[PDB]
Structure formats: structure tokens, C-alpha cells
């Protein structure tokens, strides 16, 4: 006549790690590291912009790939892999900081500069390297100022943008660096060229430099871009001889949003708060091993493939 105490066991047990014991069999366990991610960008509940082959720099500057992305509002800005910033060859000083600022934004508005040029200036300069529909074009938000009459000296010219708003504007301009001494003379003349730019908080000077260079998109010349934030109530003045690629509109970065760099397809059904190159990560678990480079509200990345957390007792089979 007896009474006996005991506990349960299971046929198939799960092996966990402890302080004293790797390989400890247990009646149950749950994974703590998320290893499965969604191949798509889960955009549900997010007002987002997909830039496609438009580079963020190209939104300020008006690259033709960016025509449908010159203004807008967003939660989430998405950048794709080989996006076009420039049509006419060149580069931008401090571009990665500039790129970050745009990917931290929540939208862009554009504001006309109301710049105006005398009769000796042709401001509808265009180029074979910026195609819109069939034809030669240029950056939509800038203007290639050249002498109306080939070979004549570009007039000494002054244009001043006044920020009359209650928020900082971002202004970009270009400096044209011609391929040949001949190209320079044709557009600007034989005078020494000089461009100075000055606000209350910025001053700089540029001199166009003629040099032999390889052709990029069929062009040996370059245009280098420069930028700066203009504070409210401040004025910025452009002084120039020819070589200034002048802004026709400036930008206002608005609010805050989440910048994603990915090649994943959008999906508006699926919801998420964590993103990486290859997609989305939706999980309860506090750890993931999909990617060390994520953005958003993400679980912490750990090197381990698996960390099983026991949810039962020791497994003791008969």
C-alpha cells in the first residue's frame, strides 16, 4: 500500500545550455534569436516614398531621374542601389552628410529664388547629358548661366537669396569646371573667372579650373556641387563672372522620417518597425542574427545562430 510522487517527461527533449552544462536535455525550449526575416519592405501604416533609381542628392538638384521626387512628405524614405545623382559628371562636397540629412527628413518643399539675369546672360543652357523626353535639358532646380553671345565676357553679376521663412533653407549651387580653355572662352570669356558665396554663417570662393579629364557621359567638363543651410532672416549672396551653376529653387527639409537603404520590394499589407538591406524584421524576440546593419526599432544583433531558452524541467526518460 503506497503513494508515489513524480514528474512528467517527453519522448523528444530539447537541448539547452546552462552555467554548468552545455548539452542539457529539457522537456521544452523556445528560441531567443530571430533568424528569419521578411524579404520585403513592410510599409503598412507608413506614409512612404520609394525613390527608385533617383538618388537623394538628385532630389535637391533636380536630376531628371528624380522629376517625380522633387517635393513630397514621408515617414520613410527608401534609397535603392544604383541610383542616379548626376547626369552631367561631377560630385558634391560633404555628400554623405548631405545624403544623411535628406534620409533623416520627413519631406521636401521647394522655394523659388526669384533670381533674374540681365540680357547679356543666356540662362537656358542645356546639355546632351541631361535628357528629358527627347531633348537636351539640365538640372531642374539649377540654371547653367552662360554668355548670350559666344566668347564674350560674362558680366559681373550679383544675386541674393533671402530666407524670409521661419525655418532654415538648404541651398545648392554648382561650379562648372570646363574641359578646355576653348570651352571656357566660349561660355564665359577670357577674363579670370571667380565666384564668391557669402551669408552670415558661410563664406567661400570658387575658381573654375580648366583641365584635361576623361569623358563621363560624353563630357570632359565637370560640375561640382556645394551646399549650405541658410538660417531664417539671413541672406546669401552670389557674386560671379561665369561658371556658377545657379539655383532657381532652394529646399526646405521638413520634419523627420526614417531613411531605408534596401533592394527589397515594398509590401503595404505587412507591418514593421525594423529594416535592413534585405528587408524587414518583425519579431517578439529580443535578439536577431539576420543583420548587424539595421535601422529602426530593432532587436539586438548577436553572432549566435541559436539561443534556446528552457521552458520545462530536466528531461528524465525511463
Amino acid at each position: 500500500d503506497k503513494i508515489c510522487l513524480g514528474h512528467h517527461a517527453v519522448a523528444n527533449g530539447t537541448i539547452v545550455k546552462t552555467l554548468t552544462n552545455e548539452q542539457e536535455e529539457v522537456t521544452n525550449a523556445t528560441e531567443t534569436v530571430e533568424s528569419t526575416g521578411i524579404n520585403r519592405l513592410c510599409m503598412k501604416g507608413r506614409k512612404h516614398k520609394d525613390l527608385g533609381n533617383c538618388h537623394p542628392i538628385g532630389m535637391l538638384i533636380g536630376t531628371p531621374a528624380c522629376d517625380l521626387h522633387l517635393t513630397g512628405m514621408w515617414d520613410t524614405l527608401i534609397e535603392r542601389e544604383n541610383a542616379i545623382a548626376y547626369c552631367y559628371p561631377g560630385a558634391t562636397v560633404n555628400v554623405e552628410a548631405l545624403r544623411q540629412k535628406i534620409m533623416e527628413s520627413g519631406g521636401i518643399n521647394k522655394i523659388s529664388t526669384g533670381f533674374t539675369y540681365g540680357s547679356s546672360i543666356n540662362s537656358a543652357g542645356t546639355t546632351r547629358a541631361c535628357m528629358r523626353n527627347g531633348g537636351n535639358s539640365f538640372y531642374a532646380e539649377l540654371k547653367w548661366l552662360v554668355s548670350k553671345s559666344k566668347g564674350q565676357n560674362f558680366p559681373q553679376t550679383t544675386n541674393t537669396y533671402r530666407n524670409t521663412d521661419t525655418a532654415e533653407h538648404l541651398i545648392m549651387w554648382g561650379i562648372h569646371h570646363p574641359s578646355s580653355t576653348q570651352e571656357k572662352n566660349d561660355l564665359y570669356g577670357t577674363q579670370s573667372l571667380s565666384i564668391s558665396v557669402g551669408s552670415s554663417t558661410y563664406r567661400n570662393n570658387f575658381v573654375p579650373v580648366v583641365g584635361a579629364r576623361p569623358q563621363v557621359n560624353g563630357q570632359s567638363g565637370r560640375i561640382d556641387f556645394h551646399w549650405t543651410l541658410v538660417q531664417p532672416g539671413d541672406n546669401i549672396t552670389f557674386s560671379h563672372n561665369g561658371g556658377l551653376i545657379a539655383p532657381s529653387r532652394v529646399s526646405k527639409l521638413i520634419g523627420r522620417g526614417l531613411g531605408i537603404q534596401s533592394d527589397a520590394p515594398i509590401d503595404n499589407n505587412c507591418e514593421s518597425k525594423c529594416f535592413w538591406r534585405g528587408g524587414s524584421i518583425n519579431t517578439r524576440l529580443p535578439f536577431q542574427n539576420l543583420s548587424p546593419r539595421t535601422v529602426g526599432q530593432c532587436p539586438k544583433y548577436v553572432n549566435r545562430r541559436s539561443l534556446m531558452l528552457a521552458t520545462g524541467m530536466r528531461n528524465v526518460p525511463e
Partner: protein, 170 residues
């Protein structure tokens, strides 16, 4: 480690399924149940561990290194060193968290197993003896309603005391 699971109890009961902890029978008529209160106390503590785990006050992070272009070399090298340093910490954190956590879950299962045992030891009082393997050899009759008295925590020992004392002592 308390003494029971993987201890003086030789093995678990694959056949038992309606709890983590139960009893097994024997008397005239007799041959298994489950304790509700003891397996709940255990389970309750697993789901508390689970809630802390899926607790997510996640900080919002943005990108500091570009996927699609060259970052400046020196600052990229600092970003790499830092990100790697941070990941070593979380890998260490994570591994320690579950090894420590696992140790405590196992040992606590053991505690609840034992605590039931001792609750019964103390109920049975003098009317029974421990066999050293998890059972209580009993020295009176009961009865399958009496056994229900043991499980239900209602058993009166002094009701059967005399009867069972003389069965132990002669």
C-alpha cells in the same frame, strides 16, 4: 539543485500529460493524477520569464554607414570597431542571459517538485514511511477516497494514527 528531478526520483513520467507534477496509485483497486497548484506555480514562473524576454522598449536607430557608397575611411573604421564592440557585448549578454536563466528554470522545477513531496510527507505524518525513491509506503488501509484526501490537502492524520503506528511497530 534540490534533490528530486534527476535526483532521488529515477525518471519522469512520459505517460503523465495533464500536468508537470502528479501522483501514482496503489491500494485495493489502485492504479495516476496531477497536482494543479504545483504545476501552475511552476508554469506561472516560466511565463514571467517569457514576458521579460519579449519586453521591448526598443530605441530608434538610424543609419551611420551607407550601404551604397564609400564612407570616409577613418570614420568607417571607427564605426566598424564600435559596432563590432557593441555586438560582442550583446552576444555575451545574450549567452549569459539564457545560461543563467536556464540554470534557474531547471533548478526551480526541482524546487516545486520537492515542495509538493514535503507537503505530503508532512501530511502523512507518522502514518507512513519514505522509501527513498519518491514514494510513501503507507501503513494503513486507504481507500481511493482517502488517497483523494492526500491530493486534495484534506487528509486527517490522527484519524488513522493508532492503526498505522502498530503496523509500523510490530
Amino acid at each position: 539543485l534540490f534533490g528530486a528531478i534527476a535526483g532521488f526520483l529515477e525518471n519522469g513520467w512520459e505517460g503523465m500529460v495533464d500536468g508537470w507534477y502528479g501522483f501514482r496509485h496503489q491500494n485495493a483497486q489502485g492504479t495516476q493524477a496531477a497536482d494543479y497548484k504545483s504545476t501552475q506555480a511552476a508554469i506561472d514562473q516560466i511565463t514571467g520569464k517569457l514576458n521579460r524576454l519579449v519586453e521591448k522598449t526598443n530605441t530608434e536607430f538610424e543609419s551611420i554607414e551607407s550601404e551604397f557608397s564609400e564612407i570616409e575611411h577613418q570614420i568607417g573604421n571607427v564605426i566598424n570597431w564600435t559596432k563590432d564592440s557593441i555586438t560582442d557585448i550583446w552576444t555575451y549578454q545574450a549567452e549569459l542571459l539564457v545560461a543563467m536563466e536556464n540554470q534557474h528554470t531547471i533548478d526551480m522545477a526541482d524546487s516545486e517538485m520537492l515542495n509538493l513531496y514535503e507537503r505530503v510527507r508532512k501530511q502523512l505524518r507518522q502514518n507512513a514511511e519514505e522509501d527513498g525513491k519518491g514514494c510513501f509506503e503507507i501503513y494503513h488501509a486507504c481507500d481511493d477516497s482517502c488517497m483523494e484526501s492526500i491530493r486534495n490537502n484534506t487528509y486527517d492524520h490522527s484519524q488513522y494514527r493508532e492503526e498505522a503506528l502498530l503496523n509500523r511497530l510490530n
